[PDB]
Amino acid sequence: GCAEGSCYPATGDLLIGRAQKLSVTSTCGLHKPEPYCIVSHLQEDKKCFICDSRDPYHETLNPDSHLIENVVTTLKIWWQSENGVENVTIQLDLEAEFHFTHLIMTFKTFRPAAMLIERSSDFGKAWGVYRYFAYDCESSFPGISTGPMKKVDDIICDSRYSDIEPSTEGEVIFRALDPAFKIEDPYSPRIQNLLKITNLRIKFVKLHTLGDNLLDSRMEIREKYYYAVYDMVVRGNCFCYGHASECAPVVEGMVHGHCMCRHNTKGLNCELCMDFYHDLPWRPAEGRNSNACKKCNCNEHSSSCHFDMAVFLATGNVSGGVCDNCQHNTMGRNCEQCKPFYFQHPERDIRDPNLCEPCTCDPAGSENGGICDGYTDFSVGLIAGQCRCKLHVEGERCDVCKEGFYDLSAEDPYGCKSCACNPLGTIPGGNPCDSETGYCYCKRLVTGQRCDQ
Ligand SMILES: *[C@@H]1O[C@H](CO[C@H]2O[C@@H](C)[C@@H](O)[C@@H](O)[C@@H]2O)[C@@H](O[C@@H]2O[C@H](CO)[C@@H](O[C@@H]3O[C@H](CO)[C@@H](O)[C@H](O[C@H]4O[C@H](CO)[C@@H](O)[C@H](O)[C@@H]4O)[C@@H]3O)[C@H](O)[C@H]2NC(C)=O)[C@H](O)[C@H]1NC(C)=O
Ligand SMILES: *[C@@H]1O[C@H](CO)[C@@H](O)[C@H](O)[C@H]1NC(C)=O
């Protein structure tokens, strides 16, 4: 179970439950009845019938309809192209984004003379070519390679499925991950650009005529050459990087496309980290390792955080979440400090909403605009609150002139100005002057500010 490590949804047939998503290029009997023939082994004999494909097949009402929706299995139904048409294309459209195992088509007539398979990850915008197939990889597909594959993603031209010999029920097969390889790293960029699929597309380009030149011929010669397909399975699954055990609707036997993520992951494919769980870098599960996204810690002064790789490494791959918009005047990568002009109450829990107290330093007399010590830490000379008074100021809040000085003006570096009280004419003992006026207390028979005159 996911509650024990990595986990993945079941595999299945993508076509099931998705019949109405199939679209063709040619289909005998769409508008008005067309006839056809079933040649045998080397043209021994031929029996012909009619193709009335203008109404959904039914065994006892309309037995000659052969629309593409007839490939999705669950008797003998099928799809069939127009007689003598050599350019037919089938297309599957997925609502979500799935992983592709393998495709298995079984024709009723004679497997294509030559065909190729394409796909799209970016919803029918860009198209990649999985592989080519032919009986003459050189005439039909000049340039494309044959022989062996130099890489697990080499586009080549197969031919083991483009014969004739198998009269009917012949099969075409394609596997995303060429069995002839060892998938070293699963989640790698290339092994991924092989399974990623939203749109499958099969293009037929050559019909086996057994000699006859369909080129301007009697409806008697072409009426026997056409692609017909009994059914086809598109094996695959809904990918969730190990973080989900089952996918939900975006029925029966149907492969769903919405990952029911777990492990604090969120996303259509759980490739993201649930909100506020950005303390470790997102990773896919493996073995019993969930690699579950880790909850951020902002000491309860936020709930918006993001993951920063630099920080992650800086801590030795321990943690990399940094908090956003620290509330309560806190600060720090985890909101574990107080912004200037505030200081941590010596008591209070670091999680307390009021952990941070405002300074009380009088800006004019203090040093550093009146920023107090933010927290206590003897070893360095830090006390929660303590203000740094200027040279000639004193008091818990630095709002007082030291004896002998006056005029606490913020406008100056040291705060107060020396009274400059003459030692002679000034009454000795206690404060020699007014802290405001700067007027010294003079002896008798002496006068004037500085008790000099
Ligand atoms: C702390 O974690 C970081 C983050 O990345 C890892 O995070 C963990 C949680 C998992 O998610 C894990 O899968 C992530 O990789 C680590 O930093 C990264 O470490 C990987 C190690 O594989 C680095 O990848 C390598 O990069 C070099 C240089 O670009 C490549 O050469 C390697 O690929 C080939 O190297 C030679 C080629 O001749 C041959 O051995 C093979 O051909 C190799 O395939 C390989 O890709 C990646 O660059 C690192 N990225 C960062 C973040 O700088 C980090 O190591 C870890 N610290 C610790 C605990 O040591
Ligand atoms: C079929 O493909 C040929 C080239 O191979 C092209 O000339 C022709 O126009 C195509 N016919 C279709 C599908 O309209």
Author numbering: 29 to 102, 108 to 283, 290 to 492
Original paper wording:
We obtained crystals of an untagged laminin β1 chain construct spanning the LN domain, LEa domains 1–4 and the first half of the fifth LE domain (domains VI and V in the old laminin nomenclature). The crystals diffracted isotropically to 3.1 Å resolution and the structure was determined by molecular replacement and refined to a free R-factor of 0.288. The N-terminus of the β1 LN domain, which starts with a disulphide-bonded reverse turn, interacts tightly with the LEa1 domain. In contrast, the few pathogenic missense mutations are concentrated in the LN domain. Figure 5 shows the missense mutations mapped onto the structure of the mouse β1 LN domain, which is 72% identical to the human β2 LN domain. The arginine and tryptophan are conserved in the β1 LN domain, but the glycosylation site in β1 LN is on the adjacent β2 strand at Asn120. The conserved patch is most extensive in the laminin β1 and β2 chains, extending to and including most of the top surface of the LN domain. Thus, the same general surface region of the LN domain is conserved in each of the three subfamilies, but the conserved residues are unique to each subfamily. The level of surface conservation is generally lower in the LE domains, with the exception of a pronounced patch on a protruding ridge in the LEa2 domain of the β chains (third view of Fig. 6B). The most likely candidate, in our opinion, is the β1 chain, which has a highly conserved region at the top of the LN domain in addition to the conserved patch on the β6-β3-β8 sheet. The top of the β1 LN domain is constructed from the βa-βb hairpin and the β7-α4 loop.
The laminins constitute a family of heterotrimeric glycoproteins. The short arms consist of one chain each and are composed of a distal laminin N-terminal (LN) domain followed by long tandem repeats of laminin-type epidermal growth factor-like (LE) domains, interrupted by one or two globular domains of unknown function. The LN domains are crucial for laminin polymerisation into a cell-associated two-dimensional network. Here, we report crystal structures of the N-terminal regions of the laminin β1 and γ1 chains, which define the common and unique features of laminin short-arm tips and reveal likely interaction sites for laminin polymerisation.
